[PDB]
PDB file of C-alpha atoms in Angstrom:
ATOM      1  CA  UNK I   1      12.771   7.220 -19.884  1.00  0.00           C
ATOM      2  CA  UNK I   2       9.223   7.694 -18.595  1.00  0.00           C
ATOM      3  CA  UNK I   3       9.465   4.925 -15.997  1.00  0.00           C
ATOM      4  CA  UNK I   4      11.515   6.796 -13.314  1.00  0.00           C
ATOM      5  CA  UNK I   5       9.521   8.817 -10.824  1.00  0.00           C
ATOM      6  CA  UNK I   6      10.590   9.910  -7.402  1.00  0.00           C
ATOM      7  CA  UNK I   7       9.120   9.163  -3.961  1.00  0.00           C
ATOM      8  CA  UNK I   8       9.767  12.420  -2.129  1.00  0.00           C
ATOM      9  CA  UNK I   9       7.591  14.131   0.526  1.00  0.00           C
ATOM     10  CA  UNK I  10       6.614  10.758   1.862  1.00  0.00           C
ATOM     11  CA  UNK I  11       8.000   8.569   4.639  1.00  0.00           C
ATOM     12  CA  UNK I  12       6.896   5.219   6.018  1.00  0.00           C
ATOM     13  CA  UNK I  13       6.453   4.285   9.674  1.00  0.00           C
ATOM     14  CA  UNK I  14       8.847   2.370  12.007  1.00  0.00           C
ATOM     15  CA  UNK I  15       6.715  -0.551  13.169  1.00  0.00           C
ATOM     16  CA  UNK I  16       5.258  -2.963  10.637  1.00  0.00           C
ATOM     17  CA  UNK I  17       1.623  -3.812  11.173  1.00  0.00           C
ATOM     18  CA  UNK I  18       0.600  -7.431  11.526  1.00  0.00           C
ATOM     19  CA  UNK I  19      -0.607  -7.723   7.896  1.00  0.00           C
ATOM     20  CA  UNK I  20       0.000 -10.853   5.950  1.00  0.00           C
ATOM     21  CA  UNK I  21       0.292 -11.159   2.169  1.00  0.00           C
ATOM     22  CA  UNK I  22      -3.141 -11.878   0.637  1.00  0.00           C
ATOM     23  CA  UNK I  23      -5.535 -10.201   3.029  1.00  0.00           C
ATOM     24  CA  UNK I  24      -8.194  -7.381   2.690  1.00  0.00           C
ATOM     25  CA  UNK I  25      -7.168  -4.171   4.547  1.00  0.00           C
ATOM     26  CA  UNK I  26      -8.857  -0.625   4.326  1.00  0.00           C
ATOM     27  CA  UNK I  27      -6.574   2.062   3.287  1.00  0.00           C
ATOM     28  CA  UNK I  28      -7.218   5.155   5.214  1.00  0.00           C
ATOM     29  CA  UNK I  29     -10.645   3.856   6.033  1.00  0.00           C
ATOM     30  CA  UNK I  30     -11.566   4.173   2.272  1.00  0.00           C
ATOM     31  CA  UNK I  31     -11.798   0.736   0.731  1.00  0.00           C
ATOM     32  CA  UNK I  32     -10.406  -2.859   1.222  1.00  0.00           C
ATOM     33  CA  UNK I  33      -7.259  -3.789  -0.646  1.00  0.00           C
ATOM     34  CA  UNK I  34      -5.309  -6.951  -1.248  1.00  0.00           C
ATOM     35  CA  UNK I  35      -1.757  -6.707   0.239  1.00  0.00           C
ATOM     36  CA  UNK I  36       0.914  -8.083  -1.999  1.00  0.00           C
ATOM     37  CA  UNK I  37       4.104  -6.456  -0.721  1.00  0.00           C
ATOM     38  CA  UNK I  38       5.183  -5.675   2.885  1.00  0.00           C
ATOM     39  CA  UNK I  39       8.284  -4.073   4.158  1.00  0.00           C
ATOM     40  CA  UNK I  40      10.578  -1.155   3.092  1.00  0.00           C
ATOM     41  CA  UNK I  41       9.853   0.348  -0.289  1.00  0.00           C
ATOM     42  CA  UNK I  42      12.471   1.813  -2.728  1.00  0.00           C
ATOM     43  CA  UNK I  43      10.713   5.020  -3.769  1.00  0.00           C
ATOM     44  CA  UNK I  44      10.674   6.139  -0.107  1.00  0.00           C
ATOM     45  CA  UNK I  45      12.281   5.176   3.152  1.00  0.00           C
ATOM     46  CA  UNK I  46      10.476   4.026   6.349  1.00  0.00           C
ATOM     47  CA  UNK I  47       8.131   1.001   6.671  1.00  0.00           C
ATOM     48  CA  UNK I  48       5.681   0.575   3.735  1.00  0.00           C
ATOM     49  CA  UNK I  49       2.933  -1.910   2.846  1.00  0.00           C
ATOM     50  CA  UNK I  50       1.936  -2.524  -0.760  1.00  0.00           C
ATOM     51  CA  UNK I  51      -1.812  -2.900  -1.369  1.00  0.00           C
ATOM     52  CA  UNK I  52      -3.760  -3.657  -4.456  1.00  0.00           C
ATOM     53  CA  UNK I  53      -7.194  -2.084  -4.926  1.00  0.00           C
ATOM     54  CA  UNK I  54     -10.151  -4.033  -6.385  1.00  0.00           C
ATOM     55  CA  UNK I  55     -10.780  -1.279  -9.011  1.00  0.00           C
ATOM     56  CA  UNK I  56      -8.536   1.397 -10.776  1.00  0.00           C
ATOM     57  CA  UNK I  57      -8.394   3.875  -7.961  1.00  0.00           C
ATOM     58  CA  UNK I  58      -4.986   3.502  -6.396  1.00  0.00           C
ATOM     59  CA  UNK I  59      -1.793   5.434  -7.198  1.00  0.00           C
ATOM     60  CA  UNK I  60       0.842   3.300  -8.842  1.00  0.00           C
ATOM     61  CA  UNK I  61       0.736   0.217 -11.136  1.00  0.00           C
ATOM     62  CA  UNK I  62       3.220  -1.960  -9.175  1.00  0.00           C
ATOM     63  CA  UNK I  63       6.240  -0.148 -10.631  1.00  0.00           C
ATOM     64  CA  UNK I  64       7.507   2.985  -8.992  1.00  0.00           C
ATOM     65  CA  UNK I  65      10.599   4.544 -10.430  1.00  0.00           C
ATOM     66  CA  UNK I  66      11.624   1.396 -12.297  1.00  0.00           C
ATOM     67  CA  UNK I  67      11.370  -0.781  -9.150  1.00  0.00           C
ATOM     68  CA  UNK I  68       8.722  -3.450  -9.579  1.00  0.00           C
ATOM     69  CA  UNK I  69       7.291  -4.767  -6.340  1.00  0.00           C
ATOM     70  CA  UNK I  70       4.139  -6.700  -7.293  1.00  0.00           C
ATOM     71  CA  UNK I  71       2.376  -7.506 -10.477  1.00  0.00           C
ATOM     72  CA  UNK I  72      -1.177  -6.093 -10.925  1.00  0.00           C
ATOM     73  CA  UNK I  73      -3.414  -3.836 -12.999  1.00  0.00           C
ATOM     74  CA  UNK I  74      -2.629  -0.088 -13.389  1.00  0.00           C
ATOM     75  CA  UNK I  75      -3.947   2.518 -11.035  1.00  0.00           C
ATOM     76  CA  UNK I  76      -4.439  -0.237  -8.438  1.00  0.00           C
ATOM     77  CA  UNK I  77      -1.062  -0.919  -6.850  1.00  0.00           C
ATOM     78  CA  UNK I  78      -1.396   1.788  -4.198  1.00  0.00           C
ATOM     79  CA  UNK I  79       1.358   2.221  -1.600  1.00  0.00           C
ATOM     80  CA  UNK I  80       0.809   3.316   1.990  1.00  0.00           C
ATOM     81  CA  UNK I  81       2.010   2.935   5.585  1.00  0.00           C
ATOM     82  CA  UNK I  82       1.118  -0.226   7.403  1.00  0.00           C
ATOM     83  CA  UNK I  83      -0.567   1.543  10.114  1.00  0.00           C
ATOM     84  CA  UNK I  84      -2.646   3.318   7.554  1.00  0.00           C
ATOM     85  CA  UNK I  85      -4.195  -0.082   6.645  1.00  0.00           C
ATOM     86  CA  UNK I  86      -6.939  -1.704   8.870  1.00  0.00           C
ATOM     87  CA  UNK I  87      -8.959  -4.824   9.037  1.00  0.00           C
ATOM     88  CA  UNK I  88     -12.312  -2.833   8.962  1.00  0.00           C
ATOM     89  CA  UNK I  89     -13.944   0.284   7.383  1.00  0.00           C
ATOM     90  CA  UNK I  90     -13.298   3.217   9.624  1.00  0.00           C
ATOM     91  CA  UNK I  91     -14.092   6.968   9.383  1.00  0.00           C
ATOM     92  CA  UNK I  92     -15.776   8.525  12.386  1.00  0.00           C
ATOM     93  CA  UNK I  93     -13.097   7.151  14.785  1.00  0.00           C
ATOM     94  CA  UNK I  94      -9.432   6.227  14.299  1.00  0.00           C
ATOM     95  CA  UNK I  95      -9.014   4.237  17.532  1.00  0.00           C
TER      96      UNK I  95
END
């Protein structure tokens, strides 16, 4: 019933960033997150990269629309494009 959201108004990239499973990456230059899933999601097309936040400040809880990618706390399993992730805290520059 409840578990059945939709992933519209969002599309992934084409190229998958060189991000391994179990590393710390900064999502949108906000905070570092542990990558658990990498590839194409189910809620939305395009390339996606699952990342787990250290604290409850993500978006999903591992399950999006019934599909369970990785297992982790709630409000932590945030999903975003691989390119969006980075190996360092950015902000003033995106190059």
